[PDB]
Structures are given as structure tokens and as C-alpha cells.
Amino acid sequence: MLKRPKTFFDISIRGDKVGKIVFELFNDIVPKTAENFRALCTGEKGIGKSGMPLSYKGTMFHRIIPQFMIQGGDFTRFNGTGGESIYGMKFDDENFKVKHDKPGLLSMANAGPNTNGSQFFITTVETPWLDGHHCVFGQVIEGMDIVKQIESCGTESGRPRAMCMVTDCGEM
Amino acid sequence: MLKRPKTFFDISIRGDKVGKIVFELFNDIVPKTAENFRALCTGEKGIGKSGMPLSYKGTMFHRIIPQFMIQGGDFTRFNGTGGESIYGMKFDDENFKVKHDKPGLLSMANAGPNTNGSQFFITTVETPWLDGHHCVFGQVIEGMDIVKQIESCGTESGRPRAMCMVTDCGEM
């Protein structure tokens, strides 16, 4: 019998520590996707195939769209073109059971079907149009205000107006 | 009678504060170029033409080449395609009096002649091949170890292996 894992990001904005976001991952619904996020928070898998630490520590939210989502998780290229899962470069969309039906959902970014690596995004609104297309695997249980601070650094193109960093992360 | 201005960057690497770099700017040799760096350290010019704060606070070293230089200063795009001077988008190469003849020199990055904005770079070796082509305008007087820590995050393509941030900056 397994519990939902908890992870956290420590956030800083524009160089200043702002607080902590705490996630709960649905390992009961998408075990393989949740477990990817869990390991990348802990860095426990060491050095990935790209020769980089498999860890969100020191990563940026490189795409931020107000009234939509914030996106991060690229720890090989820090610009949205990289990232790597614990399973390899890419892994398949596990399932689409959970809907983007509320704010503060954790969901896998992808460049098409079954291209999951390490990039994730956090919704700040309902985004049902992403249902069936991005795999929701956990939710924000603490720190939605921090999410809304990062969101407030965004533009409609997604280009950020400020650098928001995961300065530390791990499992609680 | 004017003294050389001093500025500083507070650095963090991979999310951890590492220390401070202190510069001395040759306002006696390149007054207009030094003054651009001075203002952008203080943020005193407020909001630039691109609608962003004219400030290095929260900016990244987006290009890092070991046994060469580290490059930062893009506060409009955070990837090497942006930046803005206090004089406008671009300003002319002031002069080329000072040579890239020692480590720890501050020099203006450019995409060709007279395209100076806000991107700078710090040499960690002698780079005489950049003489006559990039405008040297100050030097590192404290924290060369921090420069060498950032450099150690680089690759030969210039892609960084870690996120090194100016978390605070100003004039001393």
C-alpha cells in the first residue's frame, strides 16, 4: 500500500528567494510519470545520458503565459529544447485519466505524442483543451501564491520578463 | 577630477550563493562604455525602451567557454539575443585603447561593429584576437575565483552546464 509522494521546489524570482511550492503526485493514477517527477526532484538517479545531473535543482521556468501556465524542467538546455527522463530521452504518455479541470495541476509538456522527458507545466486556470494531449500527474498542494508570482512574470508569447528559478528541490 | 567607479555582482550557481565579483571600470579611457555598465548595475535608469528594467539584477551567464570567457548581460531575452544600453538599443564602439592582454577583463560583447547594448563578457585568459573588435571597459578587482567557478560550468560550444545568476548588483 503506497501513499502519494510529496515534492517541493524552492523558488527565487529575479534573484530573491520567494518561497516554496509543494506538490502531491498521483502515483496511484500515473505511477511511471509521477515517479519520473519524483526522481528528478531528488536527483537520486545521478548523471543522465546527456552527462547532466538528473535534477531540477537550478532550473528555470523558461515559458510563462499569464492566465494559462508556467513551464520549466529543462535541465540539459535551460531554454525549452532539452530535458531527459529517468527512462531515457523520451517516454510515452502514460494515460490521460486526469483532466486539466482546475488550477495548480502538474502536467507533462511535450513536443507531440509520447515525447515526455522532464519538462512539466503548472496550470493557473482550467485548460480542458489540453486534455487527451498532456499527461496530468500531480497537483500543487502548497504555494499556489508562488505559482501566481511566477505567472506574473510572463507574457502572452511565453517569453519571461524575469528569471524564476528552482534553487532547491527534493522529496518531503 | 573623477575616480574609477566600482560595481559588483552577487553570484549564485545552480541555486546556491557563491560570492561576489567586484569590478573597476575605466571611465578615464572609455567613459561612455563604462557609464553604460555602471547604470545597468545600479538600475538607476528605470524602465528601458523595451519595457524592461535597465538592470543586470537577476540575469544569467548564458554563454560560458572554459579557457576563454563568460558572457552575460542580456536582461530583455535572457538567452543572448537581447539586451539594451542606456543610450538605446545599440551604441558605437567607443574606442579600442585597452587590450585583452590579461585575465579578468570586462569587455563588450557584440554581433558585429558598433552593436553594443548590454551584453558583456569576462575573459579568463589572454584573448588578443578580440583586440580591435570588442571594447574593453573595466576589470575584475575582486572575486576572480567566482569567475573561475562560473567558467567551470561551461562547455566548448558555450552552452552552460549550470545556471549562474547575478542575483544582485550595484555600485559601491
Numbering used by the authors:
A (entry chain A), B (entry chain A): 1 to 172
Authors' text:
However, for Myb1, the nuclear translocation is regulated by TvCyP1. The interaction of TvCyP1 with Myb1 leads to the cytoplasmic release of Myb1 from membrane-bound vesicles, an important step preceding translocation to nucleus.
To elucidate the structure of TvCyP1, we crystallized it and obtained hexagonal crystals that gave optimal quality X-ray diffraction and belonged to the space group P6122 with the following unit cell dimensions: a = b = 38.51 Å, c = 365.70 Å, and α =  β = 90°, γ = 120°. The crystal structure of TvCyP1 displays the canonical cyclophilin fold with a β-barrel structure composed of eight anti-parallel β-strands capped by two α-helices at the top and bottom. With one of the crystallographic symmetry mates, TvCyP1 seems to form an anti-parallel side-to-side dimer, which was earlier confirmed in solution. An interesting structural feature of TvCyP1 is the presence of an extra small beta sheet between α1 and β4. The active site pocket is far from the dimer interface so that substrate binding to the active site of each protomer is not hindered. The dimer interface forms a pocket and is stabilized by hydrogen bonds, salt bridges and hydrophobic interactions between non-conserved residues residing in the loops between β1 and β2, α1 and β3 and α3 and β8. Hydrogen bond interactions between conserved G51 of the divergent loop and R161, R14 and conserved K57 and a salt bridge interaction between D16 and K57 are seen at the dimer interface. Hydrophobic interactions at the interface are formed by the residues M60, F78, M163 and M165.
